[PDB]
């Protein structure tokens, strides 16, 4: 634990990147989190929503 | 744009509708602005034969 200050910064940056990438898997109330699935399953009036 | 259609087809003169005259006769855009006007014309556009 001598080098904890640098490792803390590295861990925080990697965790922020992992969280930002992970947030793509969330649908945020939509039917799916995949854009291709929505574009292939629905008409543009509701796919737009 | 003036035409004569059936009574059940007046729902198809709208953005984002699936239907027959919507696809092959008269299509409205999704960003359509304006008014659709429909009235019964059985006394004028109909014959007993």
Curated annotation (Swiss-Prot), chain A:
Q: Which domain of life is it from?
A: Viruses
Q: What is the recorded phenotype of mutating residue 12 to H?
A: In strain: Omicron/BA.1, Omicron/BA.2, Omicron/BA.2.12.1, Omicron/BA.2.75, Omicron/BA.4, Omicron/BA.5, Omicron/BQ.1.1, Omicron/XBB.1.5, Omicron/EG.5.1
Which parts of the chain are coiled coil?
7-49
Impact reported for residue 39 to F: In strain: Omicron/BA.1
Mutation: residue 8 to N; reported impact is: In strain: Delta/B.1.617.2, Mu/B.1.621
Q: What is this protein's function per UniProt?
A: Subunit of the fusion protein that is processed upon entry into the host cell. Mediates fusion of the virion and cellular membranes by functioning as a class I viral fusion protein. Contains a viral fusion peptide that is unmasked after S2 cleavage. This cleavage can occur at the cell membrane by host TMPRSS2 or during endocytosis by host CSTL. In either case, this triggers an extensive and irreversible conformational change that leads to fusion of the viral envelope with the cellular cytoplasmic membrane, releasing viral genomic RNA into the host cell cytoplasm.
Question: What is the name of this protein?
Answer: Spike protein S2'
**Source species:** Severe acute respiratory syndrome coronavirus 2
Q: Which residues of the full protein are shown?
A: 943 to 991 of 1273
UniProtKB/Swiss-Prot annotation, chain B:
Subunit organization: Binds to host ACE2. RBD also interacts with the N-linked glycan on 'Asn-90' of ACE2. Cleavage of S generates a polybasic C-terminal sequence on S1 that binds to host Neuropilin-1 (NRP1) and Neuropilin-2 (NRP2) receptors. Interacts with host integrin alpha-5/beta-1 (ITGA5:ITGB1) and with ACE2 in complex with integrin alpha-5/beta-1 (ITGA5:ITGB1). May interact via cytoplasmic c-terminus with M protein. May interact (via N-terminus) with host bilirubin and biliverdin, thereby preventing antibody binding to the SARS-CoV-2 spike NTD via an allosteric mechanism.
Name the chain's protein. Answer: Spike protein S1
Q: What's the superkingdom here? A: Viruses
Consequence of changing residue 49 to S: In strain: Omicron/BA.1, Omicron/BA.2.75, Omicron/XBB.1.5, Omicron/EG.5.1
Describe what happens upon changing residue 11 to S: In strain: Omicron/BA.2, Omicron/BA.2.12.1, Omicron/BA.2.75, Omicron/BA.4, Omicron/BA.5, Omicron/BQ.1.1, Omicron/XBB.1.5, Omicron/EG.5.1
Function description: Attaches the virion to the cell membrane by interacting with host receptor, initiating the infection. The major receptor is host ACE2. When S2/S2' has been cleaved, binding to the receptor triggers direct fusion at the cell membrane. When S2/S2' has not been cleaved, binding to the receptor results in internalization of the virus by endocytosis using host TFRC and GRM2 and leading to fusion of the virion membrane with the host endosomal membrane. Alternatively, may use NRP1/NRP2 and integrin as entry receptors.
Q: Where is this region: Integrin-binding motif?
A: 6-8
């Amino acid at each position: 634990s001598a080098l904890g200050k640098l490792q803390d910064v590295v861990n925080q940056n990697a965790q922020a990147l992992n969280t930002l990438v992970k947030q793509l898997s969330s649908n945020f109330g939509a039917i799916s989190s995949v854009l291709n699935d929505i574009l292939s399953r629905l008409d543009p009036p509701e796919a737009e929503v | 744009d003036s035409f004569v259609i059936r009574g059940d087809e007046v729902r198809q003169i709208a953005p984002g509708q699936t239907g027959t005259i919507a696809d092959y006769n008269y299509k409205l855009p999704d960003d359509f602005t304006g008014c659709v006007i429909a009235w019964n014309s059985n006394n004028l556009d109909s014959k007993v034969g």
